[PDB]
Amino acid sequence: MSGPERITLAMTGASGAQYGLRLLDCLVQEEREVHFLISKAAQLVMATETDVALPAKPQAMQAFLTEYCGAAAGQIRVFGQNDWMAPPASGSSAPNAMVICPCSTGTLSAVATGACNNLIERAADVALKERRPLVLVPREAPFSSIHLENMLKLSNLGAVILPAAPGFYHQPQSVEDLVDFVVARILNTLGIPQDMLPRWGEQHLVSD
Amino acid sequence: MSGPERITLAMTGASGAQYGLRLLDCLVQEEREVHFLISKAAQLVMATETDVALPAKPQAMQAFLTEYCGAAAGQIRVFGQNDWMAPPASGSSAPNAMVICPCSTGTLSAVATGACNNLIERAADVALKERRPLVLVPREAPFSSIHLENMLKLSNLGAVILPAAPGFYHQPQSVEDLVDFVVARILNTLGIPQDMLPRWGEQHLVSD
Amino acid sequence: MSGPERITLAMTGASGAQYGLRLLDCLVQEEREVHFLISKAAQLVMATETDVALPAKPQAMQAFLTEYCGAAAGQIRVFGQNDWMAPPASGSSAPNAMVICPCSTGTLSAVATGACNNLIERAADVALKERRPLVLVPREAPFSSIHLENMLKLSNLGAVILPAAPGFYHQPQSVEDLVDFVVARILNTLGIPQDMLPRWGEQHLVSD
Amino acid sequence: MSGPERITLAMTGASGAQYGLRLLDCLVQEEREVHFLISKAAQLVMATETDVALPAKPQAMQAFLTEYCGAAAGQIRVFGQNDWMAPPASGSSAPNAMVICPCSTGTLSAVATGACNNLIERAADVALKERRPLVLVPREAPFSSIHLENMLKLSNLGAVILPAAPGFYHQPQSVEDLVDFVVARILNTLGIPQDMLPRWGEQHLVSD
Amino acid sequence: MSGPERITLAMTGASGAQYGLRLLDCLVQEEREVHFLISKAAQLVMATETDVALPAKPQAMQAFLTEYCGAAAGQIRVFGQNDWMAPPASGSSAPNAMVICPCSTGTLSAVATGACNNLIERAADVALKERRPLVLVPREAPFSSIHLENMLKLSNLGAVILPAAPGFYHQPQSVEDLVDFVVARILNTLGIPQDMLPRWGEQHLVSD
Amino acid sequence: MSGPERITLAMTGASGAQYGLRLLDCLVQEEREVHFLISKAAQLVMATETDVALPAKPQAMQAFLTEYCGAAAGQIRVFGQNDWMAPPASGSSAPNAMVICPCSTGTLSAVATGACNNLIERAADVALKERRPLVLVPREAPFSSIHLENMLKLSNLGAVILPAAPGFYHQPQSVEDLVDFVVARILNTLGIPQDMLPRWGEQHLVSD
Amino acid sequence: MSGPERITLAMTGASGAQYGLRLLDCLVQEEREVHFLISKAAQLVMATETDVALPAKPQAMQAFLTEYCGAAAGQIRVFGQNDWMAPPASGSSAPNAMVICPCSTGTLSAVATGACNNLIERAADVALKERRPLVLVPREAPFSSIHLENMLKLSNLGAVILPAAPGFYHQPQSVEDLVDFVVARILNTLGIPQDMLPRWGEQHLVSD
Amino acid sequence: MSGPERITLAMTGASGAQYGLRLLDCLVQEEREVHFLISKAAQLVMATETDVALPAKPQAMQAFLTEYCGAAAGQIRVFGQNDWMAPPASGSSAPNAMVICPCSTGTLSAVATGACNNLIERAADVALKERRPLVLVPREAPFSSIHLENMLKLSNLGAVILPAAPGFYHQPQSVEDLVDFVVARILNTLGIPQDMLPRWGEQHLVSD
Ligand SMILES: CC(C)=CCN1c2cc(C)c(C)cc2N(C[C@H](O)[C@H](O)[C@H](O)COP(=O)(O)O)c2[nH]c(=O)[nH]c(=O)c21
Ligand SMILES: CC(C)=CCN1c2cc(C)c(C)cc2N(C[C@H](O)[C@H](O)[C@H](O)COP(=O)(O)O)c2[nH]c(=O)[nH]c(=O)c21
Ligand SMILES: CC(C)=CCN1c2cc(C)c(C)cc2N(C[C@H](O)[C@H](O)[C@H](O)COP(=O)(O)O)c2[nH]c(=O)[nH]c(=O)c21
Ligand SMILES: CC(C)=CCN1c2cc(C)c(C)cc2N(C[C@H](O)[C@H](O)[C@H](O)COP(=O)(O)O)c2[nH]c(=O)[nH]c(=O)c21
Ligand SMILES: CC(C)=CCN1c2cc(C)c(C)cc2N(C[C@H](O)[C@H](O)[C@H](O)COP(=O)(O)O)c2[nH]c(=O)[nH]c(=O)c21
Ligand SMILES: CC(C)=CCN1c2cc(C)c(C)cc2N(C[C@H](O)[C@H](O)[C@H](O)COP(=O)(O)O)c2[nH]c(=O)[nH]c(=O)c21
Ligand SMILES: CC(C)=CCN1c2cc(C)c(C)cc2N(C[C@H](O)[C@H](O)[C@H](O)COP(=O)(O)O)c2[nH]c(=O)[nH]c(=O)c21
Ligand SMILES: CC(C)=CCN1c2cc(C)c(C)cc2N(C[C@H](O)[C@H](O)[C@H](O)COP(=O)(O)O)c2[nH]c(=O)[nH]c(=O)c21
Ligand code: NA
Ligand code: NA
Ligand code: NA
Ligand code: NA
Ligand code: NA
Ligand code: NA
Ligand code: NA
Ligand code: NA
């Protein structure tokens, strides 16, 4: 298996719920175990931007996402925002890679400062202290200096700052193609195979 | 007239030629004078990502863009990359707002360090020294610390760092809707009217 | 009209509820639209320091403030602390100036770090990213280095740090004169006319 | 009396509830007044790590701790997390020394940034601004750079960063001996007598 | 005696002469020796803001203040701005606490940079080098980054930055109540008893 | 084999000789090759805190530790403090992970500044330059800003700062349980299997 | 008793052995307990600059200094450079103030970086972590930026940097008067009475 | 001639007038042209610490110093504190080395910040901009962080910070020997011959 067996996927309240849902689908299809976390604000983004009717409480949410993605029983493990007995809360847990997608400016802030006010924030704090992968996918424009400083500090500490800034160099034809671009780069960063975005120049041998 | 009469629009070699072409169209439709600059790499992005067959040399390029956008004679003024007798090269010029869209990581770097190696870079240098508007629209993912530090320095100095990171909170249905999101925010930042992206919450009076 | 048409006025839990209430009154009298936000702690400051019996919930609060200030229907628009569909939550909103008066040390902190944990904090974050006015009115003594660093960062980024530190150079005769001093400086900073605090030296022509 | 008459003892959600309970016992035995604060997460640490069945609400908690420690009526004063009318919330209060034991990484963060989101955080903010003692007892491993920067900033500002890192140089024979080591150093830092940890080398007169 | 026997009280040219006069009165009433210093600009503030007719020269000023405050002969010791043979000019002097109230932005600057251009500035320089108390009471709004950086540097070095920012949480009824608030906090910072501002929450035992 | 084949284990003169001895035992049991280094001060810690009678000179020490741990001939390789012909002295050596356990404040300092005054310090210097694992286990309380800055610099450069700060969340019953906690985290950081500390939450599937 | 009961007096290898010997004499005369430490280089300074024939080994040195100063048995306690069982090596010791007089540039460096290579350096490290007094008396000219940065860092952390830079404002008539000036300032900094250097301006009441 | 032909010698108001007078004497004896500057505070130091009755005004002062030092007519050139037509005020002047001896903390500050408030300060500013020698001889103890930062900045910019901290390694027998030590180091720094302080170790050939 290339890449991590387990991914902590946290959705926070930036625009771009579709990115997180598509990533979840792809992780499931790649037979990975996903520890899924979602903020209250992200639930309201999802309701605003999609037709997904996500149940609010963890057990119902787990059953719903398992069906939605065609996952195996136990493959998607949902934890609530104060569930400190979940694996991501401790560095003594089995190792996971972590992705926050989308990453609100507020969660970016919390991670940069070490606020640890809920399980998402603590999970990121743990990832950093244990030197386990941490990928943040912010969606904001403009970025202020506040945002930039927070991203810089985290990138300097080894987090991957991967803005939801899709490329156009494969002539996207739909919204889904642009969503898939970002998801592909997340997967590439994690070392998980993907066939949505070709390997640039792989079959280019010499310059024209 | 709300907003600037003149905009220096520079296209550099990041993905997202469509953003710059759409912005040009909208500026023309808003009856603004555009001083248009394009890098060699941006010409190759445009050829790769679009069906626009842009002529290489400034005079031909000017005639072509005037036709393409339905602009008035003289409305789009194209300057070459070493044309120091063009207005954007001096702070003694009539004031323009400047947008670099898309903004490559290399142009971001040049602007941050003050390299002034061509007219785009010098134009940005001038904007900063004269405290005239400067908006950079980078398209990259991940952002490294190199990128982030350069963006931070410029944001601290009053440039607007506006990543090509479209929002989804108006349920986009096409690639064009996502392009129009970013273009709308550029226009909003410049103070130019636009009717592509509603004013959020304008008719919300009290909380539920 | 000189100055902004719309002001987001946030009250947070520092001492000096009278400053925020007086500012609200003056904004109403100047025919401005006010997007009014108040924290839970500020509600307890107001109950402790004033005889104003402010209702807790936004709709009731809106009706009460409209009566209290003699505002027009629709002139004061109250939003709750999680109301992300309110204008101040997005930079795609119509532009407002923002004042946090009083500004607790905790809200100062949140704004400086980018915490965005409620609508007040997100609104400030938006103001900074969009380069729209942001005035913070802290009331604390002593200021620690924590406070000072947070104020410095924000002032460097263009926020106005306007401490509730009234002057005595017009021989104030009451508490209200000292309240009006601070409110006058807030109005001056926003570019809104006021006749509470004279223009110093306006009719001085030469030195003695 | 050597040392402070009053100690604000805050327990937050790091591992090591035993340290805070032992410190409380020792402070009581030294006839000090304790203003006791505990976070929601710390209540769940205490339930997980000890057999102490602490009641949730302040009045019940006060009665329970008074009995548990053999304190005098009024000696332990419990305040809830939003009780701004408690002494620690204002610098106009009678002076107390403050100890956060254990200190979670999240509370460390809040104190470093000035978040003031509850009474513990505000109490620490007050201690710093008034230059009153503040001792933080973090329990984490590894420490990331996030943690380290926060500790460094606070130590530079005069807080004592006292990690729950017991020494072995008095040949500890039980868990309690290691708990007592840390508690002894806290007491020493506060200037409160203790006879758990000898004064190193006190009766050494010259080198061998 | 709690607190310092001797206080160097310097008045500089910020608004708020009443704060310095009230502090002087309270120090006298607490039987402290005061080494009183006043800048030329502060003399013009006092004449503008009060009805106190302070004589210009030190001997006359000393006699006048002694009468005004009901001080003992020798209790108030006035030194001129170039009087290097006064105690505050040398760290070999008997120890004093020092308060600059009000503290102009210019004196704040001088202290931060070490300018030592007159006895007030040198006295502060001495306080810092000898690690003797130094309290600055600035009165300005807005604070620029210039002001903030200067205050930050000094707070980091152990000075107390105590802005003339009175609280309202004891329902002040007059200007004098607001003056007394600030003076009370100065006295509290110095460790001198005062009965103008109650000890917050002293008789609160448990949360509601 | 998961984790490194070879570990350079350096013991320096902080309290907590038991941690280093237990780690050595566990590494031996996991069939790893250990390049063992010990400072003069650490030898005096070991004699003070344990009943282990460690011989002073490398050959005798090697024979003694081999017996003590039940190691294979050649499995523990002891090098003296000036033995520059030992593998850890050069980056051209076969790769090892390095652990300094316990890590004195003086060795922390030396590593942070690059002092390279003995083989332990040079070995760490090499680890950093070659980007090979380096784990420091300090035992000190309080940590001063000196200590914190040194730890911060090293953590920023990729070293793991793992304080000897055991957790209590598995209800330790002896000193050995607390020693084993820290050793388990060291092993986890190195990627070496251990069964002393469970994987937190591994069999938790959804929130309560 | 004003000032500390115990002083750790370390002599290191800067010029000015007379300062350290005079300080020792004065501390003895003030009935203080002195924990005396001396570096190898300082022994060679003392032999070069004075006629004091100090024995090399701690026991002999203790007997010699006791006689030389007319101290009580037990009043001067000499510890060798590796004597970790001496009080100054641990923060669990009874509190002492510490003076390094003279302070070589190398010891200044060691203290600033936290090197802890001998008992003097460790003792200083302990003083800083425990927030106990630490006074360094460097003697060097010029000071390089290396020296200055080290002094700055330590002064920022609360150490007193007291250069052997005697004043002339009491018209010194001998070398001993200049030695006594510096010793007097050390004593003043520690809060120990001295009658060598008058209190400047004590009997000055008003300006001329 | 080794060393500069012309020296700007400024005396400012630190203790140690004897150092500046002795330096002046030695410069005269070495046949150098001296541009002599003295502050008002330095005149009061000189009157306090010496029996030199220096006239206040430049012409009288010039005649007096010429006699006092046995200088040639024209050799000592005195300029007043506002004499901008003197050579040291412009970098277009013939080059001089500059020494400020003694250097008050206030003049140190002015030089570090660039205040240029009188001819001494402007002269130093000029020296720095022209990269001409600048030696500052401060006399203060303790040095605060204010002082240290100012000295550090200037040393980093190439000024020589030469504290009036005499050495004892040539067994000084009088105050004059200690004065001559500092003066000798100033002369050495300037490259002017002196025979007061031997060249250390010049006739040492090998180690003992
Ligand atoms: C159109 C509005 C109001 C903003 C665009 N977008 C967004 C869309 C929708 C539809 C909602 C509701 C909210 C957002 N926000 C704001 C955000 O959720 C909040 O600041 C919030 O406190 C974040 O908390 P968490 O970190 O999730 O715990 C948010 N935050 C952000 O960083 N980027 C975004 O794109 C947006
Ligand atoms: C798929 C590749 C090779 C990259 C995606 N994209 C891009 C697409 C295409 C199709 C081409 C050709 C080039 C890019 N680049 C690279 C970029 O043009 C260069 O670094 C270049 O030096 C920039 O110079 P200028 O600043 O314009 O003068 C570039 N640079 C950047 O910052 N962002 C991008 O999205 C991309
Ligand atoms: C006399 C006390 C307890 C303090 C004076 N004053 C104040 C008065 C009253 C009467 C109450 C109740 C609270 C305060 N506080 C504390 C403050 O509200 C809190 O830190 C709180 O978390 C702020 O949260 P928000 O930012 O509003 O969400 C507060 N905070 C602050 O920055 N400045 C103040 O003046 C005071
Ligand atoms: C075994 C786990 C999940 C961690 C070890 N330990 C701990 C034990 C237990 C059993 C629980 C439940 C929680 C922790 N935590 C996490 C911590 O409580 C939270 O981040 C929390 O948000 C802190 O909030 P507060 O600052 O108290 O308001 C925590 N935080 C920390 O800084 N150090 C710790 O030792 C641990
Ligand atoms: C209404 C005006 C002109 C300002 C309000 N106020 C003030 C009132 C009055 C009535 C006078 C005359 C002067 C002030 N100033 C300016 C200040 O005195 C000067 O900058 C001055 O150089 C200070 O020198 P010092 O530090 O005292 O030596 C001053 N400076 C300051 O920091 N805060 C103030 O409140 C004011
Ligand atoms: C109870 C005393 C004197 C201190 C507790 N402990 C300790 C215990 C014992 C019993 C001895 C003997 C020494 C220590 N030290 C001091 C330390 O060994 C020294 O600073 C030394 O120079 C370190 O050199 P190395 O880096 O090993 O080369 C030391 N240093 C440290 O960082 N942490 C400790 O816990 C302690
Ligand atoms: C005339 C010489 C060679 C220098 C003047 N003086 C001095 C005098 C004598 C006569 C000796 C022998 C040595 C010095 N030194 C150098 C110093 O001792 C060393 O750098 C040494 O390593 C210091 O180690 P420690 O910190 O004591 O462990 C030294 N160091 C210093 O900082 N200031 C001094 O004044 C002098
Ligand atoms: C015993 C006193 C009051 C101090 C010791 N000494 C000194 C002695 C005498 C006897 C006088 C009168 C003054 C000083 N001072 C203070 C100093 O002159 C002033 O700060 C002054 O503003 C300096 O201005 P300039 O830079 O010369 O323009 C001063 N300043 C300084 O940096 N170092 C000193 O040694 C002393
Ligand atoms: Na928290
Ligand atoms: Na160039
Ligand atoms: Na948040
Ligand atoms: Na808050
Ligand atoms: Na001056
Ligand atoms: Na070395
Ligand atoms: Na060492
Ligand atoms: Na000037």
mmCIF file with all atom_site columns, N, CA and C in Angstrom, chain B residues 29 37 47 58 99 104 106 147 167 176 201:
data_model
loop_
_atom_site.group_PDB
_atom_site.id
_atom_site.type_symbol
_atom_site.label_atom_id
_atom_site.label_alt_id
_atom_site.label_comp_id
_atom_site.label_asym_id
_atom_site.label_entity_id
_atom_site.label_seq_id
_atom_site.pdbx_PDB_ins_code
_atom_site.Cartn_x
_atom_site.Cartn_y
_atom_site.Cartn_z
_atom_site.occupancy
_atom_site.B_iso_or_equiv
_atom_site.pdbx_formal_charge
_atom_site.auth_seq_id
_atom_site.auth_comp_id
_atom_site.auth_asym_id
_atom_site.auth_atom_id
_atom_site.pdbx_PDB_model_num
ATOM 1  N N  . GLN B 1 29  ? -16.019 46.287 -20.488 1.00 0.00 ? 29  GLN B N  1
ATOM 2  C CA . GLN B 1 29  ? -17.453 46.551 -20.393 1.00 0.00 ? 29  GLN B CA 1
ATOM 3  C C  . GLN B 1 29  ? -17.804 47.710 -19.385 1.00 0.00 ? 29  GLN B C  1
ATOM 4  N N  . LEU B 1 37  ? -0.324  44.155 -20.217 1.00 0.00 ? 37  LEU B N  1
ATOM 5  C CA . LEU B 1 37  ? 1.023   43.611 -20.225 1.00 0.00 ? 37  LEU B CA 1
ATOM 6  C C  . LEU B 1 37  ? 0.909   42.099 -20.123 1.00 0.00 ? 37  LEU B C  1
ATOM 7  N N  . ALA B 1 47  ? -1.998  29.808 -24.698 1.00 0.00 ? 47  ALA B N  1
ATOM 8  C CA . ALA B 1 47  ? -2.056  28.876 -25.857 1.00 0.00 ? 47  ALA B CA 1
ATOM 9  C C  . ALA B 1 47  ? -2.402  27.455 -25.354 1.00 0.00 ? 47  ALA B C  1
ATOM 10 N N  . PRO B 1 58  ? 3.250   43.461 -29.733 1.00 0.00 ? 58  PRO B N  1
ATOM 11 C CA . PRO B 1 58  ? 2.264   44.400 -29.157 1.00 0.00 ? 58  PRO B CA 1
ATOM 12 C C  . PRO B 1 58  ? 1.233   45.022 -30.111 1.00 0.00 ? 58  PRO B C  1
ATOM 13 N N  . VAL B 1 99  ? -3.318  45.193 -11.460 1.00 0.00 ? 99  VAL B N  1
ATOM 14 C CA . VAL B 1 99  ? -3.705  43.815 -11.136 1.00 0.00 ? 99  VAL B CA 1
ATOM 15 C C  . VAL B 1 99  ? -2.745  42.903 -11.911 1.00 0.00 ? 99  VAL B C  1
ATOM 16 N N  . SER B 1 104 ? 2.255   34.515 -11.405 1.00 0.00 ? 104 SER B N  1
ATOM 17 C CA . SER B 1 104 ? 3.137   33.390 -11.194 1.00 0.00 ? 104 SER B CA 1
ATOM 18 C C  . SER B 1 104 ? 3.914   33.529 -9.874  1.00 0.00 ? 104 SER B C  1
ATOM 19 N N  . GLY B 1 106 ? 7.040   33.252 -9.759  1.00 0.00 ? 106 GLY B N  1
ATOM 20 C CA . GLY B 1 106 ? 8.203   34.019 -10.094 1.00 0.00 ? 106 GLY B CA 1
ATOM 21 C C  . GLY B 1 106 ? 7.982   35.521 -10.109 1.00 0.00 ? 106 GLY B C  1
ATOM 22 N N  . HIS B 1 147 ? 6.879   31.151 -1.051  1.00 0.00 ? 147 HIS B N  1
ATOM 23 C CA . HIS B 1 147 ? 5.706   31.842 -1.573  1.00 0.00 ? 147 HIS B CA 1
ATOM 24 C C  . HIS B 1 147 ? 5.014   32.658 -0.485  1.00 0.00 ? 147 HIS B C  1
ATOM 25 N N  . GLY B 1 167 ? -14.953 30.662 -4.307  1.00 0.00 ? 167 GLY B N  1
ATOM 26 C CA . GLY B 1 167 ? -15.927 30.149 -3.361  1.00 0.00 ? 167 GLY B CA 1
ATOM 27 C C  . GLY B 1 167 ? -17.088 29.428 -4.055  1.00 0.00 ? 167 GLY B C  1
ATOM 28 N N  . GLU B 1 176 ? -17.151 28.644 -15.704 1.00 0.00 ? 176 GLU B N  1
ATOM 29 C CA . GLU B 1 176 ? -17.319 30.095 -15.792 1.00 0.00 ? 176 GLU B CA 1
ATOM 30 C C  . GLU B 1 176 ? -17.837 30.746 -14.542 1.00 0.00 ? 176 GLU B C  1
ATOM 31 N N  . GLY B 1 201 ? -25.731 38.775 2.296   1.00 0.00 ? 201 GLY B N  1
ATOM 32 C CA . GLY B 1 201 ? -26.552 39.183 3.427   1.00 0.00 ? 201 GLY B CA 1
ATOM 33 C C  . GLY B 1 201 ? -27.198 40.524 3.271   1.00 0.00 ? 201 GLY B C  1
#
